[PDB]
Amino acid sequence: RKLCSLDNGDCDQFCHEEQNSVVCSCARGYTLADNGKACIPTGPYPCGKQTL
């Protein structure tokens, strides 16, 4: 298990293998963090989050 197959490439959301390296991306309404792995909501009520 390499790249995206290894724990989702350390990505929070989407993972893609590109030129033999992991590339993370995020759903609409999230921005990819500086580490290029975490997904940060752009505003309130981001998609996919229970309201608690």
Partner: protein
């Protein structure tokens, strides 16, 4: 939903309820954005005129967060067939935008390849709705949810008296008494990944509810992601 548990405060915020003129729920839907609801195409032939309700967990009480929305545009997949329920998908554009709040929030749309290798290979997904609590009963007045294991594609075709197309997948249990049921149609099948819930299915059909050797049949949302995308662009 047969079995499972009640959705507690804030747990199924992407649930929508299609309600007829008598204000009776007849189908579910998934909140995709402030203007768009995902539902099943076969649900469109279940009422003449209908509206969409969101933020509701208990159809007997009024907990402040509920809101009725008129439908502006109905976008049904042009290939939908009542014969097999193939292409059982529709998107609704509302006249006024949904206000997100507690119990009202969209589910995420995933990317196709990642969804297929990562979400649909998880052990389970979550289906929810106000449908019947038993095959022969009445609609639930409480929103319910239920974790349903993904079912091996071969096993599913073997179990079914009706054709399972590639636009469908199966979830549920062989013998255990838990399953989606009538009235849950059009509602969400979501898959959790690291505390984010992604749309993976639409409740479509089943031979009864929770029968032995029978599973729930869901529209495969990954097959229609470009279609959904296009439908929301106009």
């Amino acid at each position: 939903i047969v079995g499972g548990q009640e959705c507690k405060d804030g747990e199924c915020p992407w649930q929508a309820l299609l309600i007829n003129e008598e204000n009776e729920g007849f189908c579910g839907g998934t909140i995709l954005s402030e203007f768009y609801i995902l539902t099943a195409a076969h649900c469109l032939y279940q009422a003449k005129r209908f509206k969409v309700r969101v933020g509701d967990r208990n159809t007997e009480q009024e907990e402040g967060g509920e809101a009725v929305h008129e439908v502006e545009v109905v976008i049904k997949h042009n290939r939908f067939t009542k014969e097999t329920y193939d292409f059982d998908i529709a998107v609704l554009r509302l006249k006024t935008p949904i206000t997100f709040r507690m119990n009202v929030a969209p589910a995420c749309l995933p990317e196709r390849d990642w969804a297929e290798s990562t979400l649909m290979t998880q052990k389970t997904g979550i289906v929810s709705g106000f449908g019947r609590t038993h095959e022969k009963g009445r609609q639930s007045t409480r929103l319910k949810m239920l974790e349903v294991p993904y079912v091996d594609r071969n096993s599913c075709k073997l179990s079914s008296s009706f054709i399972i197309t590639q636009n469908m997948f199966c979830a549920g249990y062989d013998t255990k008494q838990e399953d989606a049921c009538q009235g849950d149609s059009g509602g969400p099948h979501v898959t959790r990944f690291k505390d984010t819930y992604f749309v993976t299915g639409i409740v479509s059909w089943g031979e009864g509810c929770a029968r032995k050797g029978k599973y729930g049949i869901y529209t495969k949302v990954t097959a229609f992601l470009k279609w959904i995308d296009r439908s929301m662009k106009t």
